[PDB]
A paper describes a structure:
Landmark proteins called autophagy receptors bind specific targets and interact with Atg8-family proteins on the isolation membrane through the Atg8-family-interacting motif (AIM) (also called the LC3-interacting region, LIR). The core of the AIM is composed of four amino-acid residues [W/F/Y]-X-X-[L/I/V]28. The first aromatic residue and the fourth aliphatic residue bind to two hydrophobic pockets in Atg8 (the W- and L-sites, respectively), and the main chain of the motif forms an intermolecular parallel β-sheet with a β-strand (β2) of Atg828. Nonetheless, deletion of the short helix from RTN3245–264 reduced the interactions with mAtg8s. Thus, the C-terminal helix-assisted AIM/LIR is a unique structural basis commonly seen in the interactions of yeast Atg40 and these mammalian ER-phagy receptors with Atg8-family proteins.
We also determined the crystal structures of GABARAP (a mammalian Atg8 homologue) bound to AIM (LIR)-containing sequences from the mammalian ER-phagy receptors FAM134B, SEC62, and RTN3 (FAM134B450–468, SEC62361–376, and RTN3245–264). Remarkably, all the AIM-containing regions of the three ER-phagy receptors are structurally similar to that of Atg40, consisting of the core AIM and its C-terminal short helix. The core AIM residues of SEC62 (F363 and I366) and RTN3 (F248 and I251) interacted with GABARAP in a similar manner. In addition, as with Atg40, the second AIM residues (E456 of FAM134B, E364 of SEC62, and E249 of RTN3) and acidic residues in the short helices (E462 of FAM134B and E370 of SEC62) interacted with R67 of GABARAP. In ITC analyses, FAM134B444–470 and SEC62355–376 bound to GABARAP-subfamily proteins (GABARAP, GAPARAP-L1, and GABARAPL2) with Kd ranging from 0.11 to 0.30 μM and from 0.19 to 0.57 μM, and to LC3-subfamily proteins (another subfamily of mAtg8s, LC3A, LC3B, and LC3C) with Kd ranging from 0.21 to 1.11 μM and from 0.92 to 5.18 μM, respectively, suggesting that these AIMs interact with mAtg8s with low specificity. These interactions were significantly weakened by mutations at E456 and E462 in FAM134B444–470 and E364 and E370 in SEC62355–376, as well as at the core AIM residues in these peptides, or deletion of the C-terminal helices (Δhelix). In addition, the interactions were also impaired by alanine substitution for R67 in GABARAP and R70 in LC3B.
Numbering used by the authors:
A (entry chain B), B (entry chain A): 1 to 134
């Protein structure tokens, strides 16, 4: 409601410790929100995901950071598809982080997007060789 | 199924960074699980909550750690009632952390317990004067 009070709640301060994103640094919020809003409108069966390396990760690079992922793929299948894009062995460690936390491997990409997408309509994922974002 | 393979999942490694608890260090898991199962059976309308101070918190002490909380109380109301037990002013900073994260102030204690109780059936909350757990 335009004339209703907006509650400011302590948990918003979690954003003080959000994961680093060069993507966010290079692109202003309004352009990001524009593109993610347009792409969610255009591929509603898919979610847009920015996949970036964690600051101290010792792990092979990824060419593209922007992915349109079917919303019914699990996180585990996404591990496989990113691993295949990085060209990692099955044994090479690969960890995802959403809001600094390893997401459930059973979870769907659509459920992660619904719960953790940002106000620019993008889901941000960091990847590392280690199990702690750092 | 006992004869079925148990999935070992990457997100379990989140527990490597679990918040400190003097309670868990002083009481072995099996005694805690016994008490949390018995107390969940006796009080189905309530959730058992362990409230302990964060390692770096500069904040008044709590005489008791063990609380039986009605599961329909909000996080905001639980803030108020813990505030009343510490005897803090309204304007004195007080933050809760569940699994290192500030919970939603609108969430119910029962929901928080459902998503975040540990295998001893206790919900663990740390409190601090600062907005980041440390």
């Amino acid at each position: 409601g335009p004339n209703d009070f907006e509650m400011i709640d302590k948990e918003e301060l979690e954003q003080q410790t959000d994961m680093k994103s060069t993507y966010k640094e290079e692109h202003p919020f309004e352009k990001r929100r524009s593109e993610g809003e347009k792409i969610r409108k255009k591929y509603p069966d898919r979610v847009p995901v920015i996949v970036e390396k964690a600051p101290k990760a010792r792990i092979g690079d990824l060419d593209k950071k922007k992915y349109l992922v079917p919303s019914d793929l699990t996180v585990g299948q996404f591990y496989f598809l990113i691993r295949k894009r990085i060209h990692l062995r099955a044994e090479d460690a690969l960890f995802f982080f959403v809001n600094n936390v390893i997401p459930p491997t059973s979870a769907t990409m659509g459920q992660l997007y619904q719960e953790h997408h940002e106000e620019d309509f993008f889901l941000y994922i960091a990847y590392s060789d280690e199990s702690v974002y750092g």
